């Protein structure tokens, strides 16, 4: 076996020119798609807040059109899913994880038009879901499409172009190139066996999509928090405690999203009509809240800059948290097209700020800024529910651009993951695959 | 299928013993890396102190610089040749094999040999980084705790070996993420599935970083400041720079390989001619660490000066050519010390040079050469040792100019692409292939 290694070591990092070039056209297409999707969602949110002007005088009629606009767009979203692509439900990260494990089909001819227009509706109604869901999955199918159209053969190409699509997808959903690659080589990849994924090819994909996103999203970051204060060595232990808190909460949030899937599955019983109607009901509630208390609704990217700056009161933060938990569970667990990834960053910001505030009053000699705790805790929920800390930590580091908080973020992130394990918690994306995959067996 | 459902529910379940033993490795790796970094600085300080006491008479101090660095080099080359020949050169290739179970981890030997040996070569002011020492010493420390606590398994043996070498690189650059990404891009068994627990690596990296920060906070290894931004219509320049790194990447691989061979003739395997030649190179480095300090040493001191564009065009060319020579000599000769760091300094110099050319050709892009310096800095690392992802994140963690990420990624990729298309090979894998193929022949 030594002699084979010597043969292999000399042939290391040699990806076929066909794969590299195809990963390029994957990234390009994922980027354009994720740009179109992002622009479409922003237009629908714009039309929706355009009607609340035509009906700004009649408050009951205002609250009516706030519900009825989000409802009709959610219904349309839930429908296109239920009728044309059941796989295009929820996030889609667990679906593309199954595709990389060769246990799920990548029916692109179905998901591409559904997840795109379906998500457009649910996100456009301002439901509490992210773009990751749509863009990562859509990304994976775009990679599959160009594998099929160009009829590319072999384990490397099918795994690589499927991974680079997912990577380009996340990278366009957060303008975070590194995060897309780190997401693949920690979370997306088959976790128990070797895989022929070319990391170099993943890169090219991620690059092109990042470039495509930067062509149409120049000079506006998704999250501008500005350079926060530093973190002194004697402060570190406080981030470990923050970790532990996220660590016990990570598995509990997973039980709620899994249970709520089951609890809402009774309300419709897997019926197309009761689902679409429950779907519009949840959606409408978001558009209502997307006026009366917008912190509780929407993706979650807007309150992040606010909460870090310490502009919310301890009263308001607690309210935001609870109401966002409820709205995150109602949207994701319901099976709407959209990721739980972005709302999980928003939740961690809130809870992190709340801890930070309590930390500031308790420790004046540390000279704390509740915002450093807000950032450390931002990707901490991703590190305790999703169980991808090295994805979360870098995802944050790319959006907030506060490298000087690298240790506190790691310490919190790792604290999240350790207690997430020690309290018997399961990787949310794997846990969803292992339930859908188990449901594929149990009915035989 | 049913196998996977069983696996998924058991994903990320590291045995607490591994996790706790990970924490103990990083701590030991960190503190040792701290002590190594203190010793080398200590010995460098002494050499400057001896130059002060014989400050008059030019040929007198040029001799005491040579002899100070020669004596210390000799001490290193000897400690390696006499007790642990495996601890020569980098050590990164040695540990990679150790992860493939194709090499032994003789910690009882390597630890003191690499520590005190590196102290010699580094402290004398040779063109070698701290990684070599710390990475190897790192793995060996991770082996020590395996043996001492009698931990059983493939996982425990691979994991504690990996975290050690990760924590090693971590405390060598104050770059936690780079260490972790190094393990999962280059260090890990590249062709089969391994039982390396990422969670355990992390914990180890944390500890060594905390240990490094407890001594070296408030002063960074490279301060560059916040550079300008890079507009989109500029990105193509970073592709070209990457292409230049793409062709030079393998040509530098050839030389380091070939100069390993040519320097093997001068001693023929003889412990005495080796030591005396290694002292001659070491002496040359201390002598040059006075008459043109940017050609000798680790090269960390010149990066800031290079990036600021303080050197002229000529001064850069010289510094490059001279540093091509001095890097080979010290690494190729099998002196204990990494090529990792000297390659950063090569990348900056070449980058700044390209940027200086760029600045005058295109006054409309409002360029700052220093941006190309930062994009080129880890481009050599992306084209020689062929770990672009580790390379990019390493630069990002030391320079802190995240707004230059696209330039950094495009250059780094444009290197690894043209390094693949011109025959080149991962330098740390090629050296492993040499050491393994020379073993079964």
């Amino acid at each position, epitope marked *: 076996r030594r002699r084979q290694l010597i043969r292999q070591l000399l042939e290391r990092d040699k990806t076929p020119l066909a794969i590299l070039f195809m990963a390029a056209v994957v990234g390009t297409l994922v980027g354009l798609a994720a740009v179109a999707f992002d622009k479409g969602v922003a237009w629908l949110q714009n039309q929706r807040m355009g009607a609340l002007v035509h009906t700004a005088d009649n408050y009951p009629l205002l609250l009516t059109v706030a519900f009825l606009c989000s409802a009709v767009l959610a219904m349309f979203g839930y429908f296109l899913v239920r009728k044309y692509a059941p796989e295009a439900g929820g996030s889609g990260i667990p679906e593309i994880e199954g595709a990389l494990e060769d246990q799920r089909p990548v029916r692109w001819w179905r998901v591409l038009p559904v997840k795109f227009f379906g998500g457009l509706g649910t996100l456009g109604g301002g439901m509490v879901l992210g773009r990751e869901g749509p863009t990562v999955q859509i990304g994976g199918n775009i990679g599959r499409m160009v594998l099929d159209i160009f009829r590319l053969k072999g384990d490397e190409a099918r795994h690589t172009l499927l991974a680079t699509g997912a990577a380009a997808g996340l990278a366009a959903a957060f303008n975070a190139p590194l995060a897309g690659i780190l997401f693949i080589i920690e979370e997306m990849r088959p976790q128990f066996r070797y895989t022929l994924i070319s990391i170099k090819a993943v890169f090219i994909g991620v690059i092109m999509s990042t470039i495509m996103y930067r062509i149409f999203n120049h000079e506006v970051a998704l999250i501008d928090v500005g350079k926060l204060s530093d973190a002194p060595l004697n402060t570190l232990w406080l981030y470990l405690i923050l970790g532990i808190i996220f660590g016990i909460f990570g598995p509990i949030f997973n039980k709620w999203v899994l249970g709520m899937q089951d609890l809402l599955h009774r309300v419709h019983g897997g019926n197309i009509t009761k689902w679409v109607l429950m779907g519009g009901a949840i959606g409408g509630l978001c558009g209502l809240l997307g006026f009366v208390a917008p912190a509780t609704s929407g993706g979650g990217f807007n309150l992040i800059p606010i909460a870090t700056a310490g502009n919310f009161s301890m009263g308001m933060l607690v309210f935001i948290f609870v109401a966002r938990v409820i709205t995150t569970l109602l949207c994701f667990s319901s099976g709407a097209p959209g990721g739980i990834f972005a709302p999980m960053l928003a939740l961690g910001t809130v809870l992190g700020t709340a801890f930070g505030m309590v930390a500031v009053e308790l420790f004046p000699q540390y000279h704390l800024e509740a915002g450093t705790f807000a950032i450390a805790g931002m990707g901490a929920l991703l590190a305790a529910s999703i169980r991808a800390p090295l994805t979360g930590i870098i995802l944050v580091l790319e959006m907030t651009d506060n490298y000087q908080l690298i240790l506190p973020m790691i310490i919190t992130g790792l604290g999240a993951t350790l207690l997430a394990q020690f309290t018997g918690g399961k990787p949310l994306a794997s846990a969803i695959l292992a339930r859908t995959l188990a449901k594929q067996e149990a009915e035989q | 299928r049913r196998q996977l459902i069983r696996q998924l529910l058991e994903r990320d379940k590291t045995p607490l013993a591994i996790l706790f033993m990970a924490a103990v490795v990083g701590t030991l790796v960190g503190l040792a890396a701290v002590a190594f970094d203190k010793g080398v600085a200590w010995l460098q300080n002494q050499r400057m102190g001896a130059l002060v006491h014989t400050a008059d008479n030019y040929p007198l101090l040029l001799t005491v610089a040579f002899l100070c660095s020669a004596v210390l080099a000799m001490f290193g080359y000897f400690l390696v040749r006499k007790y642990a020949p495996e601890a020569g050169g980098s050590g990164i290739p040695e540990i990679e094999g150790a992860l493939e179970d194709q090499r032994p981890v003789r910690w009882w030997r390597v630890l003191p040999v690499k520590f005190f040996g590196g102290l010699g070569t580094l402290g004398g002011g040779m063109v070698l980084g701290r990684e070599g020492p710390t990475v190897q010493i790192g793995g060996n420390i991770g082996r020590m705790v395996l043996d001492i606590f009698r931990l059983k398994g493939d996982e425990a043996r691979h994991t504690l070996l990996a975290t050690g070498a990760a924590a090693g690189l971590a405390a060598a650059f104050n770059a936690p993420l780079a260490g972790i990404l190094f393990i999962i891009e280059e260090m890990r068994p590249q062709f089969r599935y391994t039982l390396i627990s990422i969670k355990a690596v992390f914990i180890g990296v944390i500890m060594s970083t905390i240990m490094y920060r407890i001594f070296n906070h408030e002063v960074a290894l490279i301060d560059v400041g916040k550079l300008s931004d890079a*507009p989109l219509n500029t990105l193509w320049l970073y592709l070209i720079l990457g292409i230049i790194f793409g062709i030079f990447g393998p040509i530098f691989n050839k030389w380091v390989l070939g100069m390993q061979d040519l320097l093997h003739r001068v001693h023929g395997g003889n412990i005495t001619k080796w030591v005396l030649m290694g002292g001659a190179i070491g002496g040359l480095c201390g002598l040059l660490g006075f008459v043109a300090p940017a050609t000798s040493g680790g090269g960390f001191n010149l990066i800031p000066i290079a990036t600021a564009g303080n050197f002229s065009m000529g001064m850069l060319v010289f510094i490059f050519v001279a540093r091509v020579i001095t890097t080979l000599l010290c690494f190729s000769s099998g002196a204990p010390g990494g090529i990792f760091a000297p390659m950063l300094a090569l990348g900056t110099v070449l980058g700044t040079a390209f940027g200086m050319v760029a600045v005058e050709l295109f006054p409309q892009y409002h360029l700052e050469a220093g941006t190309f310096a930062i994009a080129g800095m880890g481009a050599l690392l992306a084209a020689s040792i062929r770990a672009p992802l580790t390379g990019i994140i390493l630069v990002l963690e030391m320079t802190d100019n995240y707004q230059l990420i696209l330039p950094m990624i495009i250059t780094g990729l444009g290197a690894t692409l043209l390094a693949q298309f011109t025959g080149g090979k991962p330098l740390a894998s090629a050296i492993l292939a040499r050491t393994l193929a020379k073993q079964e022949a």
Partner: antibody
């Protein structure tokens, strides 16, 4: 954001005056600054630019020390020294903060202007 | 240095009219900018990169062109648009301005 250039007025032919533009409301570093002038009734002619670290200063096709563009990041101030002032230098002088979109630079925020009248 | 020439030097149209002015270049240019200078005020970055509108510029304004010909178009002009509109390129150093199109209003 506000640019308030001053120090102009009356100068004797062949003389020399120093214009100062005082900036506020934005980090004055990070930004390239520029000078643009407009002779009465006529259009815009670029004078010169300066980067934040003062390491690059480019001028329009002029002569010796005709224009000397400098800056003091400490005071948030841009300067323009005009030497051997002739009747063509009778104009309105704008300090303009420079920026770009896709990469081809524009004049982002313009100051009010100071008037220079060259006369005896 | 590229010589940009602005088509109408002075033009007059009544509100509601579609108005197109032109900035033509001696050599080839790309991503040219536009400036509005109303009487007695400093120029204001109006259109930039050929067709992007600065924040605050009403959507009645639009820009286009490529190579040598470029045009700023006001779709249904309004009386408050009475200004002088300078174009400017910086695709070739040094940057250079136009002569100006002085838009006048007919009421």
């Amino acid at each position: 954001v506000r640019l308030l250039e001053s120090g102009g007025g009356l100068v004797q032919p062949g003389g020399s005056l120093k214009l100062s533009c005082a900036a506020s409301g934005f980090d004055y570093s990070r930004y390239w600054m520029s000078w643009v002038r407009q002779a009465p009734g006529k259009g815009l002619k670029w004078i010169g630019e300066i980067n934040p670290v003062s390491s690059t200063i480019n001028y329009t096709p002029s002569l010796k020390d005709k224009f000397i563009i400098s800056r003091d990041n400490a005071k948030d101030t841009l300067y323009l020294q005009i030497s051997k002032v002739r009747s063509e230098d009778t104009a309105l002088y704008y300090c303009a903060r420079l920026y770009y979109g896709y990469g081809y630079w524009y004049f982002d925020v313009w100051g009010a202007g100071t008037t220079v009248t060259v006369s005896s | 240095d590229i010589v940009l020439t602005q088509s109408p030097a002075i033009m007059s149209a009544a509100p509601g009219d579609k108005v197109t002015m032109t900035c033509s270049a001696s050599s080839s240019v790309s991503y040219i900018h536009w400036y509005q200078q109303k009487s007695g005020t400093s120029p204001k970055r109006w259109i930039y990169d050929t067709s992007k509108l600065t924040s605050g510029v009403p959507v009645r304004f639009s820009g286009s062109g490529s190579g040598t010909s470029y045009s700023l178009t006001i779709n249904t002009m309004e009386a408050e648009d009475a200004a002088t509109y300078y174009c400017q390129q910086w695709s070739s150093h040094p940057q250079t301005f136009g002569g100006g199109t002085k838009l006048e209003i007919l009421r």
